[PDB]
From Swiss-Prot, chain A:
The gene is rplN. The lineage of its organism: Bacteria, Bacillati, Actinomycetota, Actinomycetes, Mycobacteriales. It comes from the Bacteria. Keywords: Ribonucleoprotein, Ribosomal protein, RNA-binding, rRNA-binding. Part of the 50S ribosomal subunit. Forms a cluster with proteins L3 and L19. In the 70S ribosome, L14 and L19 interact and together make contacts with the 16S rRNA in bridges B5 and B8. InterPro entries: Ribosomal_uL14, Ribosomal_uL14_bac-type, Ribosomal_uL14_CS, Ribosomal_uL14_sf. This is Large ribosomal subunit protein uL14. Pfam families: Ribosomal_L14 (PF00238). One of its GO terms (molecular function) is structural constituent of ribosome. The keyword Ribonucleoprotein applies.
UniProtKB/Swiss-Prot annotation, chain B:
This is Large ribosomal subunit protein bL17. The chain holds residues 2 to 118 of 199 of the full protein. One of its GO terms (cellular component) is cytosolic large ribosomal subunit. It comes from Mycolicibacterium smegmatis (strain ATCC 700084 / mc(2)155). Coiled coil: none annotated. Part of the 50S ribosomal subunit. Contacts protein L32. The lineage of its organism: Bacteria, Bacillati, Actinomycetota, Actinomycetes, Mycobacteriales.
Curated annotation (Swiss-Prot), chain D:
Keywords: Ribonucleoprotein, Ribosomal protein, RNA-binding, rRNA-binding. GO terms for cellular component: cytosolic large ribosomal subunit. Signal peptide: none annotated. Part of the 50S ribosomal subunit. Forms a cluster with proteins L14 and L19. This is Large ribosomal subunit protein uL3.
From Swiss-Prot, chain E:
This protein is located at the 30S-50S ribosomal subunit interface and may play a role in the structure and function of the aminoacyl-tRNA binding site. It comes from the Bacteria. The gene is rplS. Coiled coil: none annotated. This is Large ribosomal subunit protein bL19. One of its GO terms (molecular function) is structural constituent of ribosome. One of its GO terms (biological process) is translation.
Length: 121, 117, 54, 214, 113
RNA sequence: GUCAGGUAGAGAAUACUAAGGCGUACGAGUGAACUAUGGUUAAGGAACUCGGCAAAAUGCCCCCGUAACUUCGGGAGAAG
RNA sequence: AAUUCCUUGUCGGGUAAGUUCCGACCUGCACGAAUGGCGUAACGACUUCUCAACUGUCUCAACCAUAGACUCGGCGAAAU
RNA sequence: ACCUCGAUGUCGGCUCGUCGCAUCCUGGGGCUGGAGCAGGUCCCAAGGGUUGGGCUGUUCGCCCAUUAAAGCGGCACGCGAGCUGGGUUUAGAACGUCGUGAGACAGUUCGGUCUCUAUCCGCCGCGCGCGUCAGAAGCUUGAGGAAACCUGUCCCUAGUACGAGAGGACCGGGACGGACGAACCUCUGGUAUACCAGUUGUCCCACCAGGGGCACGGCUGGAUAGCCACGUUCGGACAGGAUAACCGCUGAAAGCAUCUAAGCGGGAAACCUCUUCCAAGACCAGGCUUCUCACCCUCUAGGAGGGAUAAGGCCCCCCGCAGACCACGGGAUUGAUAGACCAGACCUGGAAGCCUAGUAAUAGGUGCAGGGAACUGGCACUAACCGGCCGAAAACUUA
């Protein structure tokens, strides 16, 4: 359950450490953003000498949330750290590797690259 | 027993417990108490549970009754006299009656007793 | 707020007449050989001898 | 045409579909109903059928209703409702004394449940109409949950009858629409309505065929 | 008596081994991946078990890639096909929520010897 | 203005308590909204607000170790 | 700029976004040297901005116990 | 300066809404220098929606992300007996200017008490009395009112029509979403002041053990029930009638022509039904049914008055997830309504005693042990009582 002015750990090799969500896309006034939702965030902290730098405006798919997410089979999934992966213009994960695990909800559509790059689920 | 489900009897919390304990002590000591209607209503389940514990009292129940009643003499006389006297009664050892209201505040007053039979 | 005008006697008495009492329902009971009137709420107490009867 | 029956909300539970998907269902007791009266256009002016459900002792049954049930030719019951049909063509499908069970419905059908929502007592505006509360700090003086303004300064004068304010909510007739009936237990006379229906456990409800999806 | 038991027994699942919060268990979940139903193994420790009859559920925690993941499963869910309890657990609480802040040795659970 | 116990506490603070004094003068009930005093909260953590206002957080004893500056005393219980 | 109407003067530092904040340019309506000019380590329940934690200020509200509000018994005002 | 200086509290922001269309989007249509997508203009249309942030008191305005949009105005430039005062507009002090001066500056900065127990009308809910022409009960037609009306992305049609190419459809279907509202605890979470377990300080039960009061329930980890959203389901219709703009058919006046002068048509999120709820105090006070449909006394027989009754209602009593009181609902000896007891589900976690190992804390067997409240099935063990009040027809005219 991510919203505006929320910090998320970046899971990729792009050089970004933590990003700050600006707005949740996919609706007029969307309150929260669960697993598989795209958002516009800014790099608040980056690795010294990385590709992206602090202050940039990018897009990222909300993955590996902390709040419980209910699946279609009555099960629930939750993690311990709110993470996110920076995506490309239309749909592609910026970088060539993922570190942490991703929820199965990513498999909705167009996230096959992230599903294959994530070494879990 | 069941919570009061609303404002407690005596002021704030931590006092209704002591009030019920003293009422049950007086009941087991005398055999007939005259209190306010809601007080007796809330004491009925308390006194019945204490009487059931006394009935079942062999060991680990004396302490369960003492953790609520402080009077050692009252606990002893309860466990001795009442004891198996209600062994044939499957609950309902206390009888409640309604009496006229007292002067000043028109508080509905009741009287709790122990079924002798 | 404060009352703006003096309420008329009509409305005053109409609103005051509602502040009345309700008579209790008595019941005849034979105690001590004599018949007396006691409410049903205290009927059992009077039968057992817990209701004072002046 | 429009099937219907009276029942009692037993409770809620979960079930599993053929694809392992979870489904929260409501177990309702659509017990046997008895047709006690049929409304016609020639006698009363509208096409309806009177059903009765629930067990009641003859000593507890009142005398007027006792005589009514005697004239109808069936035993008394607790609750009596009326389902308004569409025409005499549909009314002719019922007869006085007919017994209806939960078999009138089928799995996967769409029903509408009608009941009496639970009572919330005298609830404030924030709970009645979701009124937005005021700031709990920054100086707010005893207005943390008050409604606020009510209308125009001096032009309207009155308060525009119909303004949302505080009062007693709930305990009113509610009707859900397009609830999927998951299963119809025949031996038990029970319906597993997909979703939640109004009213508490053990309360009377009336299930009917859906209008928008019947 | 669970009034709705006459409806819950039809869905109640057997062959459910007896476990308690704190024991290491690996659950097998049937997951459909693009018109292909496979079995995914999730090995963790039962941190809590909420009993409600048919709605009884259990939560399993797993530390993977330095990140903790908690997964709740209904005991009587048909999507599961195997629940193997590898080692028991010697704990005192009924819901091991305190494990959300321990890592490695500090997160290790005792074993009923 | 004078007497200043006991238990832990650096302490006449803090919690209970010994001797001592009191339940102090309108009361019994009822989970209404709402007002005031406190407690708790899934995710974000000032994004509310003119304004971190109010709330929230550390808080003590023994140690390792403390920057820019300086009037050389200090910053400093810096910080961690 | 506590001093400037033009002014949100222009450039740069920070925020994704900054009429606020800091330095510079100097066009000084209408700064200026004991009604002191320029800074100052420490200091201030003075004012302003930012950062790390923190939390119901908010997103977004929800529950629990008390003193009122509600019923009963008695006494019993008010401003207009 | 026409009411208001023997008081009309002035700019914002929060909450709360109502109304106009000179319409930001959705909807329909005409012309286009409209090839298509995408535009320019006009007409009708107010049912619905019209975002969150940084600057600045700000209104306004600029910028950052989107979305269809982030509309213009009236309601004392709406709303302070609903809320704060960031500023204006007291008393203090400072900066630059005027003034010898006290003092002033729609020039600037710091801080600077927001009172009132609702009388009447108005609004949101709940009762009492009476009426609907005998006394009561069950089910309902319904005039007349209230609630909802939002829409995005993707796939097929179709990379088709269009178009040199680029680019790229109208119409009709299918899938998934954003916001709102209704219900509910089945799942997840929030709270659980008579639930469980550990423990610091302290006093007490003569003492160990085991226990009790206070220090926010003393603090934490859980917590059955009720309520709630963060959670689970349902809805924005389908269709019918009349229309605005618009498109039309037969047609003269005026031998032609013309959508009109007589008719027939289509025509939108606008209007009325349709969807949800209230409603016969709708005084035209409704309709289909069922229970009782008969007992006395007085006034001087014209009506009236008083008493006692049938059905029924009410009071008293046990209660509710119904509730401020009320009122509603269930029961009341021909009963499981509530409390107690047993059992089950569930919460907590392994109780007291004994024995064993250890000098000791402590661990192991008796033991899914002990403790518990809301949920459920039995059980009259206790209270619904050998009990009181209201409560049924004047007649006449026509057919
Ligand atoms: Mg206490
Ligand atoms: Mg307050
Ligand atoms: Mg006003
Ligand atoms: Mg369990
Ligand atoms: Mg209260
Ligand atoms: Mg929180
Ligand atoms: Mg948290
Ligand atoms: Mg801000
Ligand atoms: Mg503060
Ligand atoms: Mg604090
Ligand atoms: Mg800021
Ligand atoms: Mg400067
Ligand atoms: Mg000067
Ligand atoms: Mg000076
Ligand atoms: Mg000073
Ligand atoms: Mg009074
Ligand atoms: Mg005047
Ligand atoms: Mg005035
Ligand atoms: Mg128009
Ligand atoms: Mg309409
Ligand atoms: Mg703002
Ligand atoms: Mg407006
Ligand atoms: Mg104004
Ligand atoms: Mg001055
Ligand atoms: Mg001068
Ligand atoms: Mg008021």
């Amino acid at each position: 359950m991510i919203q505006q002015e929320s910090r998320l750990k970046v899971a990729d090799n792009t050089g970004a450490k933590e990003i700050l969500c600006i707005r949740v896309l996919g609706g007029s006034s969307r309150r929260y953003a669960g697993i598989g939702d795209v958002i516009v965030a800014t790099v608040k902290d980056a690795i010294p000498g990385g590709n992206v730098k602090r202050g940039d405006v990018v897009k990222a798919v909300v993955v590996r949330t902390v709040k419980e997410r209910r699946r279609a089979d009555g099960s629930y999934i939750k993690f311990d750290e709110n993470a996110a992966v920076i995506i490309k213009n239309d749909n592609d994960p910026r970088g060539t590797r993922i570190f942490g695990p991703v929820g199965r909800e990513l498999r909705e559509k167009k996230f096959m690259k992230i599903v294959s790059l994530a070494p879990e689920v | 027993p069941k919570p009061t489900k609303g404002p407690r009897l005596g002021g704030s919390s931590s006092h209704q417990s002591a009030l019920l304990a003293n009422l049950a002590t007086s009941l087991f000591e005398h055999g007939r108490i005259k209190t306010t209607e809601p007080k007796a209503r809330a004491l009925r389940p308390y006194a019945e549970k204490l009487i059931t514990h006394a009935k079942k009292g062999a060991l680990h129940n004396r302490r369960e009754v003492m953790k609520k009643i402080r009077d050692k003499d009252v606990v002893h006389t309860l466990f001795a006299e009442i004891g198996p006297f209600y062994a044939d009664r499957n609950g309902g050892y206390t009888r409640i009656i309604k009496v006229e209201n007292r002067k000043g505040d028109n508080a509905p007053m009741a009287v709790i007793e122990l079924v002798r039979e | 707020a404060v009352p703006k005008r003096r309420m008329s006697r009509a409305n005053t008495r109409s609103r005051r007449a509602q502040w009345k009492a309700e008579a209790p329902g008595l019941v005849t009971v034979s105690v001590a050989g004599q018949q007396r009137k006691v409410p049903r709420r205290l009927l059992k107490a009077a039968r057992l001898g817990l209701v004072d009867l002046d | 045409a429009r099937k219907g029956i009276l029942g009692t909300k037993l409770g809620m539970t979960q079930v599993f579909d053929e694809n392992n998907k979870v489904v929260p269902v409501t177990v309702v007791k659509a017990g046997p109903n008895v047709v006690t009266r049929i409304r016609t256009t020639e006698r009363d002016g509208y096409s309806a059928v009177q059903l009765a459900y629930g067990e009641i002792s003859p000593r507890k049954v009142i005398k007027p209703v006792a005589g009514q049930f005697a004239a109808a030719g069936v035993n008394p019951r607790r609750h009596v409702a009326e389902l308004r049909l569409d025409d005499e063509a549909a009314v002719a499908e019922y007869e006085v004394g007919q017994e209806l069970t939960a078999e009138i419905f089928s799995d996967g059908a769409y029903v509408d449940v009608t009941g009496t929502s639970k009572g919330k007592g005298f609830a404030g505006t924030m709970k009645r109409h979701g009124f937005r509360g005021q700031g709990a700090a920054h100086g707010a003086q005893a207005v943390h949950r008050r409604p606020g303004s009510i209308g125009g300064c001096a032009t309207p004068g009155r308060v525009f009858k119909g303004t949302r304010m505080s009062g007693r909510m709930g305990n009113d007739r509610v009707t859900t629409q397009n609830l999927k009936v998951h299963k119809v237990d025949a031996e038990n006379g029970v319906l597993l309505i997909k979703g939640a229906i109004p009213g508490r456990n053990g309360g009377l409800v009336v299930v009917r065929s859906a209008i928008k999806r019947g | 008596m669970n009034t709705l038991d006459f409806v819950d027994q039809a869905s109640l699942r057997d062959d459910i081994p007896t476990f308690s919060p704190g024991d290491t268990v690996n659950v097998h979940v049937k997951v459909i991946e693009g018109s292909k139903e496979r079995i995914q193994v999730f090995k963790g420790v039962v941190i809590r078990r909420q009993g409600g009859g048919i709605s009884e559920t259990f939560t399993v925690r797993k530390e993977s890639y330095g990140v903790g993941v908690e997964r709740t499963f209904p005991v009587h869910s048909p999507n599961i096909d195997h629940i193997d309890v590898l080692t028991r657990g010697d704990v005192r609480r009924a819901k091991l929520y305190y494990l959300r802040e321990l890592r490695g040795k500090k997160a290790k659970i005792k074993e009923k010897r």
